[PDB]
DNA sequence: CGGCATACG
DNA sequence: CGTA
DNA sequence: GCCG
């Protein structure tokens, strides 16, 4: 089992599910309390676990797994001879725990945030209802909005989603294209959100576009909530349902295509199998890369991509599919 | 011990 | 600060 | 919290 998330394949659904979910919520506490490298340890014992081909049913089996260390795999040894942990079940019902998840599942509201709120004594989404003077545009529309985002976007949503953007992007630009990417490109049948990722075949003609494209969604009635020169947008829109319609966080990302490549790979994620891949490149590679390129600081060069598969091949890596993506 | 991904709005 |  |  190697070390990085990279070097692995991981599938969306796998025969550890309950270990990952308890890790993950002792990394979920540990990054409420700004503790990054203890969630990231816990987020990689998690995925060192989806990566396993069969169920861990006895201690031993944890001997040599990377990001096992006494922590996680007393975890895991509780989890095997009772059913539960109790560190885990201390967490989840703590309101420290319940409450900084709440106001962090709100669409504006980070850790920080969340935090200060907690300690100013805020617990409920009412109780910031009753103090609308203190959010940000953004936070009242994730707030008034908070009840449909907190229901999945289902993949028989996405189809009829990608249609209307791709009709106001085909309008702001003949040519250009909308690619599906983020969790439902790695086979996910639900979601938080959808991420698209738009590209023009003429290097150069994708510039200015988003700003095109959300003028276009905004004059159909289909934007709830936009920010508004940009390349990124973070938007609600109005999906339609029997009868009536529901909000739901739509992200669009332009790229110039000598960039298309970098920009895939980075939005289609996991987020962890991002940060690994960064890590890898930089620790073992001696390279950086970002959504824009790999760059060698050495030679001072980027290296062109035309592919995902490419970019593998780069790092000195095992191709994975998005669906094998899911660290 | 240092390090822990990276950038845009 | 927020967001991906 | 764990790795190198
Ligand atoms: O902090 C972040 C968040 C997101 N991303 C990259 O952006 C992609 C989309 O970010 P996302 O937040 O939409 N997550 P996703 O995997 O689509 O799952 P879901 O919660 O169902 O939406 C992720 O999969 C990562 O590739 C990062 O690189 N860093
Ligand atoms: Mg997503
Ligand atoms: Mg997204
Ligand atoms: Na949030």
Not at 111 to 121: F, I, L, P, Q, S
């Amino acid at each position: 089992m190697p070390a990085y998330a990279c070097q692995r394949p991981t599938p969306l659904t796998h025969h550890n599910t309950g270990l990952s979910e308890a890790l993950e919520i002792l990394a979920e506490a540990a990054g409420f309390e700004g503790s990054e490298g203890r969630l990231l340890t816990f987020c990689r014992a998690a995925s060192v676990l989806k990566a396993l081909p069969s169920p861990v049913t006895t201690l031993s089996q944890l001997q040599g797994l990377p990001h096992f260390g006494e922590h996680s795999s007393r975890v895991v040894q509780e989890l095997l001879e009772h059913g539960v942990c109790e560190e885990v079940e201390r967490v989840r019902r703590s309101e420290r725990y319940q409450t900084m998840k709440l106001f962090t599942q709100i669409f504006g509201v980070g850790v920080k945030t969340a935090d200060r709120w907690y300690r100013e004594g805020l617990r409920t989404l009412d109780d910031l209802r009753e103090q609308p003077q203190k959010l940000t545009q953004q936070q009242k529309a994730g707030l008034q909005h908070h009840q449909d985002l907190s229901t999945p976007v289902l993949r028989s949503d996405v189809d009829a989603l990608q249609q209307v953007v791709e009709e106001a992007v085909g309008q702001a630009l003949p040519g250009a294209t909308v690619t599906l990417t983020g969790g439902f490109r790695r086979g996910k049948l639900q979601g938080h959100d959808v991420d698209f990722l738009i590209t023009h075949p003429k290097e150069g003609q994708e510039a200015g576009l988003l700003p095109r494209v959300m003028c276009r969604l905004q004059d159909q009635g289909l934007i709830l909530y936009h920010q508004h020169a940009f390349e990124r947008s973070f938007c609600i829109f109005r999906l339609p349902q029997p009868g009536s319609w529901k909000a739901v966080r739509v992200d669009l990302v332009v790229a110039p295509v000598s960039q298309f490549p970098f920009a895939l790979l980075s939005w289609t994620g996991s987020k962890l199998f991002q940060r690994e891949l960064r890590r890898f490149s930089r620790k073992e590679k001696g390279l950086w890369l970002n959504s824009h390129g790999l760059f060698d600081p050495e030679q001072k060069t980027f290296f062109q991509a035309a592919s995902e598969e490419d970019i593998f091949r780069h790092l000195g890596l095992e191709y994975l599919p998005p669906e094998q993506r899911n660290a």
